[PDB]
């Protein structure tokens with residue numbers, strides 16, 4: 469029935485980026501994505517180096533990096549290759565296809581040049597994916613579609629979520645999975661990544677809501693936890709990352 | 725019943741940014757927003773200078789400007805003040821509140837420092853607005869909510885559109901209107917801006933769909949047309965802008 473990450477990495481219809489990710493998840497016993505929500509390049513790189521062994525993925529918001537340069541991203545790639553994790557820019561492309569292709573390839577960030585994965589909202593219709601994939605397919609990249617959100621009042625529910633699943637499953641040459649709160653596709657080739665995760669109950673004062681790794685991986689069937697402040701705001705970010713890694717990994721093993 | 729732009733600028737509940745815009749629209753007889761979808765700063769600035777007298781607003785995507793600097797945006801502000809138009813960064817904020825506040829204030833673009841207006845998708849729930857307004861209210865800025873999209877397969881329909889209207893009307897200290905294809909709010913204090921506009925029928929090969937100024941302003945009741953390629957790709961962008969300005973202005977007068 470359910471397959472391990474290592475077996476999912478071999479599925480006939482697996483995308484190469486998903487396969488690479490699934491293999492390193494199994495090798496390293498990690499299904500943790502660090503949300504590296506910092507404004508300094510030095511802190512980003514120090515976190516990537518120290519936490520690299522503990523993570524399958526590092527998620528960026530490079531538009532909050534006060535001292536972004538392309539050379540910072542070259543350094544990040546070196547760490548990603550060393551420690552074996554993917555880089556996911558959480559850009560939330562959400563425009564018409566003709567615009568998003570330029571936002572993905574160009575400008576000062578040149579996201580496609582360094583991000584293994586990006587994500588998109590499905591609200592514009594499938595042209596958002598078609599535009600991205602024109603840049604992403606030649607660059608051998610993957611994309612995640614936002615099927616659900618963690619925040620209070622999210623409209624990514626019901627028929628909207630179903631539309632995201634259909635759009636992913638119809639663009640499988642580029643779309644490798646979802647941002648979601650739970651398993652939303654029954655096809656094991658697709659990844660499920662879940663933000664809004666902390667060990668303790670709570671939220672923030674701007675609509676964020678938290679659930680635990682056991683809830684999201686174990687009871688809701690997601691694959692990967694995305695954790696920002698639960699790690700970033702801790703004193704010892706390495707031990708915090710290890711606590712989240714162990715939590716998510718055991719929840720995965722026990723559902724398997 | 726229906727009020728002119730100049731009278732709407734005086735409504736009791738008008739936002740100061742909306743009032744400023746409405747007054748210059750009436751003064752200059754323009755309800756045209758140029759979508760300055762170019763990758764070179766020199767072309768952006770040359771368009772802003774030449775077309776400034778013809779437009780009420782210049783819409784940017786600064787993340788496609790290959791040679792962005794904050795000094796480019798200082799030059800753009802000088803032109804906006806000279807010719808009297810607002811600057812609208814079409815960033816489509818679409819994250820949780822805690823993230824979007826940092827994307828609006830910070831990073832290399834420092835959007836809030838130069839953009840009169842920004843926009844947001846409503847899919848995350850109202851925390852997206854609450855996060856933005858924490859930066860935007862002290863900086864005396866305004867925001868547009870994306871209630872409908874012009875592209876094929878858009879999911880911004882039905883209950884989603886109604887949720888966008890409610891979210892705007894409940895955050896009127898910061899939200900001044902909508903991106904929409906038609907009038908969606910019955911409250912005249914809110915602006916309606918409509919992309920997907922060309923004089924001729926057609927679309928693009930990535931899901932864009934076009935309607936004419938007479939259709940969108942006259943028959944659908946919107947306030948402002950947003951025009952990119954219909955102007956940008958023309959040989960004489962000034963005459964193209966004048967054709968779109970005259971079309972949108974007459975459609976407004978005839979519905980009034």
Ligand SMILES: O=c1ccn([C@@H]2O[C@H](COP(=O)(O)O)[C@@H](O)[C@H]2O)c(=O)[nH]1
Nearest residue numbers: 503617618663664695696697819820823
């Ligand atoms: O539905 C979503 C989609 C994305 N994020 C992102 O995931 C991270 C959550 O951070 P934290 O709340 O763990 O600090 C942030 O970067 C945020 O932008 C969410 O929180 N919820």
Ligand SMILES: O=c1ccn([C@@H]2O[C@H](COP(=O)(O)O)[C@@H](O)[C@H]2O)c(=O)[nH]1
Nearest residue numbers: 563564567759873874919920951952953
């Ligand atoms: O529903 C929407 C929202 C925004 N835009 C933006 O408006 C402009 C349309 O350009 P064009 O098709 O007139 O060239 C682009 O910058 C695009 O990103 C749309 O086209 N449709």
Ligand code: NA
Nearest residue numbers: 499713716717
């Ligand atoms: Na883990």
Ligand code: NA
Nearest residue numbers: 755969972973
């Ligand atoms: Na006009």
